[PDB]
Amino acid sequence: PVDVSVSIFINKIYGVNTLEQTYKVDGYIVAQWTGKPRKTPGDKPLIVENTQIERWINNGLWVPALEFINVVGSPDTGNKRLMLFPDGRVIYNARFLGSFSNDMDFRLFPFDRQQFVLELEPFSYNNQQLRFSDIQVYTENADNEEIDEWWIRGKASTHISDIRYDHLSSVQPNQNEFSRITVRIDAVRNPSYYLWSFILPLGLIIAASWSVFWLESFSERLQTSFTLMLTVVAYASYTSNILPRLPYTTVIDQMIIAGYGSIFAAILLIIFAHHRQANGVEDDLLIQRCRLAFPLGFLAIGCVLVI
Amino acid sequence: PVDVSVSIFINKIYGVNTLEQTYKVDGYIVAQWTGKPRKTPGDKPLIVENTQIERWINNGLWVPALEFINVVGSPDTGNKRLMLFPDGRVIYNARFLGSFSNDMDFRLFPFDRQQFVLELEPFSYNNQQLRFSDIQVYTENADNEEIDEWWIRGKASTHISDIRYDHLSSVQPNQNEFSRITVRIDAVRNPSYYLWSFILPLGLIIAASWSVFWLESFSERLQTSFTLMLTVVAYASYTSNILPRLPYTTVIDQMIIAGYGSIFAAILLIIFAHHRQANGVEDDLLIQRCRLAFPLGFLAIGCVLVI
Amino acid sequence: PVDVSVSIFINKIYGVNTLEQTYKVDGYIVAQWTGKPRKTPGDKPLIVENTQIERWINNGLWVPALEFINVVGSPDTGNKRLMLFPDGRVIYNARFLGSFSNDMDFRLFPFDRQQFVLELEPFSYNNQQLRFSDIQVYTENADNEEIDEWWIRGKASTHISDIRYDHLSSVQPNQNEFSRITVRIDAVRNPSYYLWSFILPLGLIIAASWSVFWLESFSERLQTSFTLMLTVVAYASYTSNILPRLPYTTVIDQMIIAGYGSIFAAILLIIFAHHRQANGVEDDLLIQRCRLAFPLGFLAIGCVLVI
Amino acid sequence: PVDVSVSIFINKIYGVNTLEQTYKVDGYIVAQWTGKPRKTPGDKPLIVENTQIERWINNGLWVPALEFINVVGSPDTGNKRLMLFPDGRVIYNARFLGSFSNDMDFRLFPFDRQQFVLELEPFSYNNQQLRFSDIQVYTENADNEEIDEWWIRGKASTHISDIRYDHLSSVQPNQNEFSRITVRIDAVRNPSYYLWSFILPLGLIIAASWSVFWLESFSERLQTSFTLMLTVVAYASYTSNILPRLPYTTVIDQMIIAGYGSIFAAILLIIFAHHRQANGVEDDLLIQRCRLAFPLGFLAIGCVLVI
Amino acid sequence: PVDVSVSIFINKIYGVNTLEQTYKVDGYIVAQWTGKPRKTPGDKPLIVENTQIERWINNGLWVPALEFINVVGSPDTGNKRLMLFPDGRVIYNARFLGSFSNDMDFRLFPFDRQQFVLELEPFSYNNQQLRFSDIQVYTENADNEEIDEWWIRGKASTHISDIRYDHLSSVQPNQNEFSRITVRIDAVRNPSYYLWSFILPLGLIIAASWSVFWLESFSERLQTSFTLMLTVVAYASYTSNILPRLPYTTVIDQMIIAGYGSIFAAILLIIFAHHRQANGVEDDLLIQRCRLAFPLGFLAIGCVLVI
Numbered sequence A, B, C, D, E: 001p002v003d004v005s006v007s008i009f010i011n012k013i014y015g016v017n018t019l020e021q022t023y024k025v026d027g028y029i030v031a032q033w034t035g036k037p038r039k040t041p042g043d044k045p046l047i048v049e050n051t052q053i054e055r056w057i058n059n060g061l062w063v064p065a066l067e068f069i070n071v072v073g074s075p076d077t078g079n080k081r082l083m084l085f086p087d088g089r090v091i092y093n094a095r096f097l098g099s100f101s102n103d104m105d106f107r108l109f110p111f112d113r114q115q116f117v118l119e120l121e122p123f124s125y126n127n128q129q130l131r132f133s134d135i136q137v138y139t140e141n142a143d144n145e146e147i148d149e150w151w152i153r154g155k156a157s158t159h160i161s162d163i164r165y166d167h168l169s170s171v172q173p174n175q176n177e178f179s180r181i182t183v184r185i186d187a188v189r190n191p192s193y194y195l196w197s198f199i200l201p202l203g204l205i206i207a208a209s210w211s212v213f214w215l216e217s218f219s220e221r222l223q224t225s226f227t228l229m230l231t232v233v234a235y236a237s238y239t240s241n242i243l244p245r246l247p248y249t250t251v252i253d254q255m256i257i258a259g260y261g262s263i264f265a266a267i268l269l270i271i272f273a274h275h276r277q278a279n280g281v282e283d284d285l286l287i288q289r290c291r292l293a294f295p296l297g298f299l300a301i302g303c304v305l306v307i
């Protein structure tokens, strides 16, 4: 039962793909285990680079495949290194870049909380043969958060476990349990850009929408309100070409609907003001004086929806 | 006639390409068959990973090529494992990610119902040489319907068959028969997002389309409807740049056609109302008060395209 | 002069790239020719898949390179199979996916008819050496044209010809003639979507444009047509996001020009009626009574461009 | 000093990447030189394709690396062929699809004409070791420019020179001059589509912009001009989605600005016209019929950027 | 401690990826060092290109792997050359295309200054085995900034330093030592297109925004003002569709915000003016005379917001 030490160096976590629920992660893996001693020039340890490694395995070297469970496709592997010690122990080293998968709820975008996840598990050897002794995760990052899209807030998670499969092969006595390394990183979205350039002008759209009411005439009140729709729709497209594609509504997505409603409500009100009467033009001078009523009556719908 | 057991592990199904009638699938194939009994180190089964598999094949290990029939181009194959047993049987283990094809009808979008399909068939060995014994597909799926894009309803459907090829080699008697595994997953689209954010606002527009009829003046009636047609056009672009690429109209696309018609029909009435006569300035007192005549007339006809 | 029979299996034709004049084709090549008698294992044929084919060539099996003339870059080659017969003949089988080139006129879009073409020609052996005996191409044809972007209508033509190069290397006597396979597939674009979501609404825009003439005031007539000019710009971009990139005008693109033109023509008429004059007020009430005139002529000028 | 004859067969030039300044080229390289007399099967020439070439080199065949100086990344290598003659001479043949770099001016878009360039230069051998004897470039060209994106009008140019590198290896004797083949192909952009679907309508817009002055009222005159501001802005977005992203203004980019200016200048006139006064109402009695001044006044200025 | 020469020939820097903090670099690397004296063919140096290098390493040749630390994924490598001189020295030569990462602030867009960084560091050899002796960087770049995306200003800075990694595999004395080459290249963005086609028209809108107060009536003063909101929105989409996507505000977007803001305050005034009163209609004849009041108050903030 080989105790295998692992260490993951996270260099960059970037390129989150919103629809696929996918992100890319650059780094190095370091795997070590103690086999039993080998002969070698002097009393040195050896360095074995890239192409010369399989030359070593062809002569019967056991170098186990350690698989990234949650990666999408095969990872781009840079330089690889075998360090063979005289006492027996063996360092495997490789740089990697791969696209990883994980469940990502974006409903409350751009205020979403997500976590970048790594899961490592040997491909061919169960826990009785190859199991992970201990694991360090080195995230060489700090400061300059206000420039990055994602703010790592935690440091790094680490969890060695045993996973068993009950539906198998049909070798069963104990080829059921593989030891699995899982790395988690909590990160928060930098909401700044969407706040000041998307949320903020939207509010100004909706507010100024309501000021259709301090128009004097009815025709003005109604006609103008159409120009306002033309406006929200226009604001929809500007939002939509640009915001990341999803299969469910975000916060902003709703705000737009809220825009549409605010108004459709205003259209009905404007017609009602005019046509609830005892003559014809009995404008409910207080319902037309929903001048400061309904802008706040819109806040009732907004903060109830916070609950 | 070699009996080969197969097992498919579906890991992620994502990236539906609507035009290419294409979807991406991450998973594993497992193939096992009984060979001639061998001598392994000790007496334990012997494990052979990646690079040395080719070495084993080159010295004569029969590993049949199993081709995915409906894959587009050759797929990203991860790790390969040969597990060689002393009793004879051989266990093939390999991870894959591929683009797969199937006829996919999207006309009833976003209410479309689909089935994701896999087809596996040996490349060079017919049914009299290589035969598919049995097939289980392990689809590690459940829950979160609500939140992500596709709702699986099936579990894993299956049909092992013999395929007859009419036009061949220079082979004669019965070697036109290949055994093929076909794996099916029935699935439904989560229409929530398109319902609330696309269908709903369109309705408010078409609702507002009709609100031109509560305008008082004639000049007011026609100028207004032009801004209103401009508005539906504005909505089309917002819609189209976002919606999936297709070669036919969706349900949504029709709603848009219905929008234009609504307005264009409204234009005809308004002009018709004004210049048909019996003095000169004959406002048809009833026809203009069709204010909620055909808006329900859209609700009647809309609920007519039903079937 | 080795006689080589070939067969092409057309699996999918997709992804027409209009500017590159490029489309994708998935399939198989089957090359068969008769070699010198070999003594095989047992007496039935020996099959060589993928990896092992390369080692057979190194020890001197002649497997001629067959290149796709009209492919863009090298094709994604799938499984490879060498089937070696005892009477001598050898059958090569390989799966491929590649992007192909051909002259593709898209002017009559969305009614363009194309032909997807495969041209096969030996790389190193001219017809004195390697000759194409015959070729059938099996298209996986039938039904569901209405769900597909392209409607294949011919069942492909085929003609083996000999192609001669006047301009060569330092080879002399008659090594300037190569035998070439040409596969043509007649295909038409599915016009449904482009008709109903693009042509139809556009027609109504141009029509409703003309109803500017039923306005009573001059001021209205002119400030109005600016909204309409605003609409054709609007309709263009909506078409523009979507329609395939070209270096020439399409049919739709023409319709848009006439739209711009129709209103700019209206602007001139509207002003002409109004300010050339005997008066100030002398809109020739019959020249402005081109409300139903100018629509007849748009079909006259419209149906000539069919010329 | 090995004399090497080279010939390039140009198959297709496509995919101009405007921001990267790169275009892709399909074709073949043909290089020939004389080696030392060899023994061939019989006495006929020997053909060596792809896989077997690698092995000829291990046993000591001198195959010089000819590098594309101006390629971006390494090119897609198709089939390779060695034709080995008994007297010694050698013919190298390869298909390529490559990403090429060259300086490209787009300021005068869409009327730009460019020259596509290839530069070939040995990777390891100076001119005294390897010298380029001559180069023919065969561009299989003719006809239907009207369907293609680019109109090649030249017939391919040729330039062999010696290139000197001042700074070093540090093998010094003369190290420093490599023989370089430079190939140029002159081409013009097909302006047809950009003329009729962009230039023409922009003009009608700017033209109709001037139609604001034949309005009788001031409010009509000023309010309307806002719509034209919206129209030019609308036309801006419509243009920008389609046009090539660049780091400088094109002819069209300016033509748009000319629109903005024509309208913005009109605004100042219209404002100036009404309120700088001797009464309240002092529209300068002849300045409001600046309806025919400013349009030709835009044309004099338009004909000014001659320069 | 092996003394190693390095030389970097940069022929292209392109493809700045704004969200990923990424840019591409094409060039060649040259590394040389002195080994133990060798027996070469004849006595002049032997050149080893591509394929034959693997053969040389198998005979026990030490060729060190030099890694680009700040690359994302592995570089696209072209031709490789070994220059083996008889006295011991060895010179490595290779083409590369790589995607590199560096901290990149884009807030001051389009007036940003950046620096492109290359970091070279041995993969397996610490400072007392392999040391970087010296480094020249050849920037074969010059002139014609007129036309390219970036303006190089420096001549690249260079700094070899010793990078020590804090913790280990357990050896303490001095094996935590790596020599690192850092190459810096200063560059500035060409603001020309973004100034003239984005900043300038934006300003005229904002200018013309203020143009609502020379309107006579209140209803028109207010009705028009909604059109300006729509126009600023319209300009947002046009800008955002084309501008590079980022996670923070640029200069231009701020201008857009100020655009929305300038309009919203004017909206407040137009209402403020009319209905604080002693009748209903006594328009503060002084506050719609704020016609050049706060355009300068906006320009004062424009002058001040630069500090």
Ligand SMILES: C[C@]12C[C@]3(C)C[C@](N)(C1)C[C@](Br)(C2)C3
Residues within 6 Å of the ligand: A121, A122, A123, A124, A165, A178, B009, B028, B093, B094
């Ligand atoms: C038993 C396992 C199950 C798994 C899903 C993952 C693995 N690491 C262990 C490899 C396989 Br082939 C076999 C498939």
Ligand SMILES: C[C@]12C[C@]3(C)C[C@](N)(C1)C[C@](Br)(C2)C3
Residues within 6 Å of the ligand: B067, B121, B122, B123, B124, B165, B178, C009, C028, C081, C093, C094
């Ligand atoms: C006979 C077959 C036909 C096929 C289309 C599919 C296959 N599995 C069996 C392989 C090929 Br090469 C030969 C092509």
Ligand SMILES: C[C@]12C[C@]3(C)C[C@](N)(C1)C[C@](Br)(C2)C3
Residues within 6 Å of the ligand: C121, C122, C123, C124, C165, C178, D009, D028, D093, D094
């Ligand atoms: C003589 C030929 C000409 C060709 C265009 C096509 C081919 N099959 C025969 C190969 C090449 Br290298 C030589 C180029």
Ligand SMILES: C[C@]12C[C@]3(C)C[C@](N)(C1)C[C@](Br)(C2)C3
Residues within 6 Å of the ligand: A233, A234, A235, A237, A238, B234, B235, B237, B238, C233, C234, C235, C237, C238, D233, D234, D237, E233, E234, E235, E237, E238
């Ligand atoms: C609503 C919009 C607004 C815009 C400025 C940009 C667009 N993408 C959406 C197209 C137009 Br025509 C309509 C003009």
Ligand SMILES: C[C@]12C[C@]3(C)C[C@](N)(C1)C[C@](Br)(C2)C3
Residues within 6 Å of the ligand: D067, D121, D122, D123, D124, D165, D178, E009, E028, E093, E094
């Ligand atoms: C001496 C040269 C200089 C060059 C820029 C181009 C080349 N063909 C000759 C290869 C290199 Br590595 C060496 C770099």
Ligand SMILES: C[C@]12C[C@]3(C)C[C@](N)(C1)C[C@](Br)(C2)C3
Residues within 6 Å of the ligand: A009, A028, A093, A094, A095, E067, E121, E122, E123, E124, E165, E178
């Ligand atoms: C010890 C090192 C540390 C490093 C960050 C960089 C390197 N060149 C030396 C490779 C690794 Br894997 C190990 C990671």
